Design a protein around this ligand. Structure first.
Ligand SMILES: [Mg+2]
Lengths: 217, 219, 221, 217
């Protein structure tokens, strides 16, 4: 395969949140077969970001997912050609984000071209007031729909004041060639900001993801 | 505990779907600490049901969930007084159900009084055309909200033609006495109709549920 | 037809809101061709109701709508056989209600058999804390879907401290015989509680409703 | 007033739908106090557009709304400084769009900078299969929320062969400076494509919009 034990990542995101423009670039590396990865992200335009950086992090590649032998791996099979994805993020207080990403591979390095746009966040809500601490770990439900792979996941941001703030993700993952389609299955995730500086101009970001069937008979 | 290794279940559900009235009664048993249970369900009014039986099954008790010792068990803690739950089920084609249940305990038997109402199902959709095969297994996200326990789950019905039909559950679980609240956690489920007669006047239904933290290591 | 200029109403609602059971019976009258009606409602069980009465009022009959002659009147055409409706009410804070009504006619009097169930209202929200003042007037968008009539309306409750609390209605209206179906149109409403007693055991309720096309002219050459 | 009886319009939209990039430029004119306007739109990049042009048209300025004297006009009051808006468009089959516009005034001419992104449209649905005929006329519900103006509208596209395809709009309108805020009210609209060429590289577009209270005593 062109997917090796260790692979590098480069990316650029451009976007808006509540009309505020920004650009972020990143570089990282990961272990596609272990489902782990780390990257460093740098704000290039739009500092200081006026919103919770956490809304961005899941937009910064299901290639980095440990897939068991008995579940077809839609993402790794898609290379060398690659894949794109499209996502809606519906927050419980009316905020809506769309995001798209085009994922290509050159040599040992993936490149992501990412667009992110967020609208209708309440001005005193947790996103515009930067009151989030982290996403909780999650379980994404993966199923085929109209020839492509869909993923839906109930996400939750733990808040400073205590309690959680909910967001529902719907993602369409689109391979650029024929791949073996998996049956309905699950991808468990844990994403974390490992470190960051004031105003999140520099962020180190980590994700662990593992695919599985039900644990139950 | 008043909750023993083996417990019985008695229930009654009254409801409507697409304006069609029905009553179902049930009796069963399970193992609260294993997270398993089986029951037999009988349609008493409204036979033959004109909609997919699968929309009802998850309304027919989180007491039947294996909880590890390091996650507080909101449900078992609530007894003998017990608890109620409230649920919305939002289907991707505009169909919406509400369901409520009040769960009490007398001796070795739980009793559920269930209400179920479904509206705005498309006439040619998989519910009214009875084109569902089963629910997929699931993972429900449990979290405290305004002093009680909430659960959200992305559910999917596998269809006869292949492909899936999606529904989003939001449930509030309300203990009738103060209990130790758990941190954010997960409940994995598998619900299965084991057997049924031609028009689902008789149904044997099984659920296995286990609570957990993330399977992924911390850091 | 069997729809007269003055007609009577009787009803019974049974329901729950956040698990609290109640029963309400009503009697009233209205003018089907004017789109106006008034009724008196009495709590029979569940008093004092622990939630905002306003969430129930739109459940307490589109026969009471003034329809111009050039828009087919789905509702009046459905009698004598009648019709039923099904509704979801999705509030912006996660509260959700379902409501169903079977509407029959005997002599000069309609009877409505109504079910109403509301779940997941936040305990400190405006519904459970009774902080609503009224519904704003509205415009419902009416369109045929799969052989029956659907109505979607963006509704808003005016709140005590100022500001609004939003709810989206989707209603399916189902005639019990074949009727002439209308093109896409609008129904304007204003529903108001005219009077009530302390705990809303006795409520007098009014609705005015008028159907129309767009007020804006069609494009021409 | 800097808002005159006749005013001009110039705009640029950049965006994506289903991952497909495009750029459209427009010029027009209208009558702010009468609530009418017409414009000509040209596809600059991304031709031929692979999706229903109708999804774009409501993104191409509530300044063009007839306002009665007894309802504060949030939009005309915002000039000369101007205003922005943010919108989510939630279609009944899972397609979701975000759009944002920044609206400025130079001389007799309004300038819009528009971004539009649409995701998760089903490949055989009416948007990707171009089965839409027009938007129906509508009534938008306008209300203050957290100090800015919100508009929610139930929209419907008339489809080929009959029937409708529904979309729910939520828009936040944000004046750059403080303006007198209006009570709950309504804006009626009718938007129409007057003419277009093969693949909609050139489109002439019209809207009429009038604000009002309820017609019922
Ligand atoms: Mg407000």
């Amino acid at each position: 395969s062109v997917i090796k034990s260790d692979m590098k990542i480069k990316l650029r995101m451009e976007g808006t949140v509540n009309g505020h423009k920004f650009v972020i670039e990143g570089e990282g590396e990961g272990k596609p077969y272990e489902g782990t990865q780390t990257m460093n992200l740098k704000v290039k335009e739009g500092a200081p970001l006026p919103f919770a950086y956490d809304i961005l992090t899941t937009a910064f590649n299901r290639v980095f997912t440990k897939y068991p032998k008995d579940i077809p791996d839609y993402f790794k099979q898609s290379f060398p050609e690659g894949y794109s994805w499209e996502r809606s993020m519906t927050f419980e207080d009316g905020g809506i984000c769309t995001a798209t990403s085009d994922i290509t591979l050159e040599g040992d390095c993936f490149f992501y071209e990412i667009r992110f746009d967020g609208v209708n966040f309440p001005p005193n809500g947790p996103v515009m007031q930067k009151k989030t601490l982290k996403w909780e770990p999650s379980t994404e439900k993966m199923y085929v729909r109209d020839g492509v792979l869909m993923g839906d996941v109930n996400m939750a941001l733990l808040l400073e004041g205590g309690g959680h703030y909910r967001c529902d993700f719907k993602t369409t993952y689109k391979a650029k060639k024929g791949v073996q389609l998996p049956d309905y299955h699950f991808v468990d995730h844990r994403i974390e900001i490992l470190s960051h500086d004031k105003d999140y101009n520099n962020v180190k970001l980590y994700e662990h993801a593992v695919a599985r069937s039900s644990l139950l008979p």
